[PDB]
Amino acid sequence: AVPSTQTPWGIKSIYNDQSITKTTGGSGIKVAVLDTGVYTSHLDLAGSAEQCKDFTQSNPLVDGSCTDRQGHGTHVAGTVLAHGGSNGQGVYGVAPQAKLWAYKVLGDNGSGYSDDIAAAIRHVADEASRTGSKVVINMSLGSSAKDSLIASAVDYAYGKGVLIVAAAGNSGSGSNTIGFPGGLVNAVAVAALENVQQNGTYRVADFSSRGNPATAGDYIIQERDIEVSAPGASVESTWYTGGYNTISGTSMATPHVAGLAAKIWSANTSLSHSQLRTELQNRAKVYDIKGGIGAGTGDDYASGFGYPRVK
């Protein structure tokens, strides 16, 4: 199988180059995709998985298993780091030289248990500290309500130098519908753009969860603030049966940002996770988003600080 294009719209968009046919970057960084599992033997993911662990079984950690029976986790991972395959004809993600830690925390219908997610986050942090690795967590998952067990795990991981990138939610366009863990102070909440222009910029998709209007505008992240926006509507990527699929959500926006984070980090390995986060914020501000319900000039509760890009 081949994708419809080796560089889906979101990839071309975040690269700010409609002409690209391949991507590069992310060497030396790990992206932990905490999701439905990943089909690590997909041609466009082969050799990327350095860890493959399952937190969903009767045993609380099954090492060497991370099987995707859903698709979502495979799709997310491809956006981060698909590398076009050995023969170069496959799909490309943002950071094709990054390595993958595939942690299965959701079951095969795309739902899971708080405890498994929290255990998985803490485990990433422990692995990061032990191995001295630079790690970005991707969590294309959540709940409308704040879950404090997950929040405790996120703070633990952030305290051990792991960047956390998480979906804002799909509860829009109503204000203050942001979910968790995206809405945590120490997670980067990612809103979803669609491939439409409004008010001179990309447009936030109506489905994307909005932050709290009361605390947007200050370019300082509080709980329930959107941080950045990325391509999230009609995103083609790798699929668990070996081909490709096109799905939507803040799920798909999140890995554009996790991937971009890995790309940036690889290009300056002297950065800490919080310096990396700060530079995501700085880049976002270069591309202020003004399109979509609640979007406007400056930091806003639809799109946060803006749209961080390669250039």
């Binding site: 109506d206 509507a233 799905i247 799920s251």
Partner: protein, 64 residues
């Protein structure tokens, strides 16, 4: 065009399903326990219902 049913919070799952299907007849309705963590895929034909132990709706149902 209906994307949320805030009036269904506290109603039974059977009632919720009737109301949702009246607006969205091809809805794929999935029932999950309150507190279940989920993917953030937006699936336009889906409506998830989160329920308490009495099968009452625990949070605003939404498309996606």
């Amino acid at each position: 065009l209906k994307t949320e049913w805030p009036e269904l919070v506290g109603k039974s799952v059977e009632e919720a399903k009737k109301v949702i299907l009246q607006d969205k007849p091809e809805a794929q309705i999935i029932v999950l326990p309150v507190g279940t963590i989920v993917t953030m895929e937006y699936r336009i034909d889906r409506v998830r219902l989160f329920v308490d132990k009495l099968d009452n709706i625990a949070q605003v149902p939404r498309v996606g």
